Enzyme design. Structure first.
Site, short mmCIF file in Angstrom:
data_model
loop_
_atom_site.label_atom_id
_atom_site.label_comp_id
_atom_site.label_asym_id
_atom_site.label_seq_id
_atom_site.Cartn_x
_atom_site.Cartn_y
_atom_site.Cartn_z
N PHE A 91 45.38 16.95 -86.61
CA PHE A 91 45.52 16.03 -85.48
C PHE A 91 44.11 15.72 -85.01
O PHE A 91 43.30 16.63 -84.85
CB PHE A 91 46.37 16.66 -84.37
N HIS B 294 41.10 13.85 -79.33
CA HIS B 294 41.77 13.20 -78.22
C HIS B 294 41.41 13.92 -76.93
O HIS B 294 40.95 15.06 -76.93
CB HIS B 294 43.30 13.21 -78.43
N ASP C 299 43.61 14.93 -73.40
CA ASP C 299 45.03 15.13 -73.08
C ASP C 299 45.51 14.17 -72.00
O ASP C 299 44.79 13.84 -71.06
CB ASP C 299 45.29 16.54 -72.58
N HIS D 56 39.20 17.48 -78.00
CA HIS D 56 39.51 18.57 -78.91
C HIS D 56 40.34 18.01 -80.06
O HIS D 56 40.87 16.90 -79.98
CB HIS D 56 40.23 19.72 -78.19
#
Ligand SMILES: CC(C)[C@@H](NC(=O)[C@H](CS)NC(=O)CCC[C@H](N)C(=O)O)C(=O)O
Ligand SMILES: [Fe+2]
Length: 329
Positions: A209, A212, A214, A268
């Site tokens: 992933f 980004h 959050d 992260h």
């Protein structure tokens, strides 16, 4: 050479008590972590994470294809037009490894006024059959309230850290209207692992992933003991060590907005690791109409020129943007 992030372990138990100076000492530690890498582990939190992991694993390993279609969100089942957030997020054998189940506030019933008004982002949870998954719904709903309670306490810590009275955030975090969600994510062991499910970062790292920030006020995460997360710093990505007894905490972009980026939302990403593991976030969201006036803790008067942002508008836009940028999960 990849370095390791400083992720302190903070005993949050004073936040459940009435020793005010002890609460201040916890707040100082939250402040320090929030201004450094942005992550800390909450320890002495009081949640039975052994039972959480066991019950989640029993669910993930016993649910069948039939049941997944019946619970699927609209991205996987055109019949379920009312399920954008809540339900089952299917894996795609040979293409997509991750699968998950998301549920919202148990108080969102057909009788709830936000459901009756069809307000965006509010949905009624869907659940598997009680006879096939005995005790699962009872467990999951109780877990929601347990982690709600931990999160309320954490929000008191964040408020004190920023020089505010302890209910500054928590007063907007209410059982009747919170948009918070739990996601029960399975990352499977697969052999062969599908190449379509591995992304290659700019720096060559294989990822599950991508980077980004959050979409949350704060994120309250339990993960099994397999290292996977990395946080971006000015000097590159750093590995976050795993701890399957603690909760990993970080701020989301709503906190960065309301603090004029004093507490940043850390960027992260999730490294690819071929191991059976669990990732169980609780996203601390406020109510649809909740608005907190932004402030700047760096200024004596706290004045900020940022516009107040309604949490509902923030969340609706943020969830869609994350799908567009990092893909449908
Ligand atoms: C990094 C972890 C939290 C986890 N990733 C995630 O949960 C990622 C990034 S924070 N989050 C999302 O996709 C947003 C889910 C929102 C949810 N459907 C809802 O309606 O409220 C992982 O392990 O991939
Ligand atoms: Fe995240």
């Amino acid at each position: 050479s990849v370095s390791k992030a400083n992720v302190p372990k903070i005993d949050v138990s004073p936040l459940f008590g009435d020793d005010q100076a002890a609460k201040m000492r916890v707040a100082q530690q939250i402040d320090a972590a929030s201004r450094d890498t942005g992550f800390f582990y909450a320890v002495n939190h009081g949640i039975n994470v052994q039972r959480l992991s066991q019950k989640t694993k029993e669910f993930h390993m016993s649910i069948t294809p039939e049941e997944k279609w019946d619970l699927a969100i609209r991205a996987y089942n055109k019949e379920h037009q009312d399920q954008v957030r809540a339900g089952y997020y299917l894996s795609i054998p040979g293409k997509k490894a991750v699968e998950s189940f998301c549920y919202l506030n148990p108080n969102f019933t057909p009788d709830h006024p936000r459901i009756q008004a069809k307000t965006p982002t509010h949905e009624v949870n869907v659940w598997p059959d009680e006879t096939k998954h005995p005790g699962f719904q009872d467990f999951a709903e109780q877990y929601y309230w347990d982690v709600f309670g931990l999160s309320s306490a954490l929000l008191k810590g964040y408020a004190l850290a920023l020089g505010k009275e302890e209910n500054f955030f928590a007063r907007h975090f209410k059982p009747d209207d919170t948009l918070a969600s739990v996601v029960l994510i399975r990352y499977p062991y697969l052999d062969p692992y599908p190449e379509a499910a591995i992304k290659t970062a700019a720096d060559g790292t294989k990822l599950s992933f991508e980077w980004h920030e959050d979409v949350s006020l704060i994120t309250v995460l339990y993960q099994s003991n397999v290292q996977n997360l990395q946080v971006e710093t000015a000097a590159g990505y750093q590995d976050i060590e795993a701890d399957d007894t603690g909760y990993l905490i970080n701020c989301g972009s709503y906190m960065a907005h309301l603090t004029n980026n004093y507490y940043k939302a850390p960027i992260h990403r999730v490294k690819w690791v071929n191991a059976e593991r669990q990732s169980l976030p609780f996203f601390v969201n406020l109510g649809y109409d909740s608005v907190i006036d932004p402030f700047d803790p760096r200024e004596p008067n706290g004045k900020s020129d940022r516009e107040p942002l309604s949490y509902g508008d923030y969340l609706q836009n943020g969830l869609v943007s994350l799908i567009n940028k990092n893909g449908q999960t």
